[PDB]
Swiss-Prot record:
Name the UniProt record assigns to this protein: Endo-1,4-beta-xylanase A
Gene: xynA
Ranges where the CBM-cenC domain occurs: 1-189
Domain of life: Bacteria
Domain note: The C-terminal CBM-CenC domains mediate the binding of XynA to microcrystalline cellulose. CBM-CenC 2 alone can also promote cellulose binding.
Species assigned in the record: Thermotoga maritima (strain ATCC 43589 / DSM 3109 / JCM 10099 / NBRC 100826 / MSB8)
Family as reported in the entry's similarity comment: Belongs to the glycosyl hydrolase 10 (cellulase F) family.
Length: 189
């Protein structure tokens, strides 16, 4: 799976900057749990600059819940990055997993850090908008650079149970530990 992200610097606030319309929109259709017509999915736009990767995720989710103690079993979005795009079967120092729920509470998997994660969440009719900035850790990207990338949407019901797991490139729910499951994202001018 291959996608592209246009160069640009949006303001992290949950509002949709005009610039987001200049880059392609991808959809999370790789089902691991649940179904597209019944569970949380997202329309995603991606931008980038020399210092950060920017992600705009518009999530469709009629019931918001975060009662479960496990952050991944709360309504939330997970963003995966493989900076050198080695597509390894385990996480290298440059690989990372970031997570943020609908209440804008951040949590981190391997490689993730609050020092490199800025987020804003705005609720909307039928769901919520996540806008994030991920600071590069090992690279200073230039046009046509390609990284490993994926975005996952966790869907929890009113009972605090996760009923949906859907991402862009991974239908096996192994992104948290396997970079070879991410897709390819080309950073273009
Ligand atoms: Ca914004
Ligand atoms: Ca890597
Ligand atoms: Ca939900």
């Amino acid at each position: 799976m291959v996608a592209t992200a246009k160069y640009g610097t949006p303001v992290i606030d949950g509002e949709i900057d005009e610039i987001w319309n200049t880059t392609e929109e991808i959809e999370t259709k790789a089902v691991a749990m649940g179904s597209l017509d019944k569970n949380a999915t997202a329309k995603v736009r991606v931008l980038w600059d020399e210092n950060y990767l920017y992600v705009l995720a518009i999530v469709k989710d009629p019931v918001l819940n975060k009662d479960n103690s496990n952050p991944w079993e709360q309504d939330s979005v997970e963003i995966f990055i493989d900076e050198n795009n080695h597509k390894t079967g385990y996480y290298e120092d440059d690989d990372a997993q970031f997570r943020v729920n609908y209440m804008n509470e951040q949590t981190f998997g391997t490689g993730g850090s609050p020092a490199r994660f800025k987020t804003a969440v705005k609720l909307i009719e039928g769901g919520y908008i996540v806008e994030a900035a991920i600071k590069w850790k090992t690279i200073k990207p230039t046009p046509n650079t390609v990284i490993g990338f994926n975005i996952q949407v966790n869907d929890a019901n009113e009972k605090g149970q996760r009923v949906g797991i859907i991402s862009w490139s991974d239908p096996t729910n192994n992104s948290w530990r396997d970079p070879s499951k991410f897709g390819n994202l080309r950073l273009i001018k």
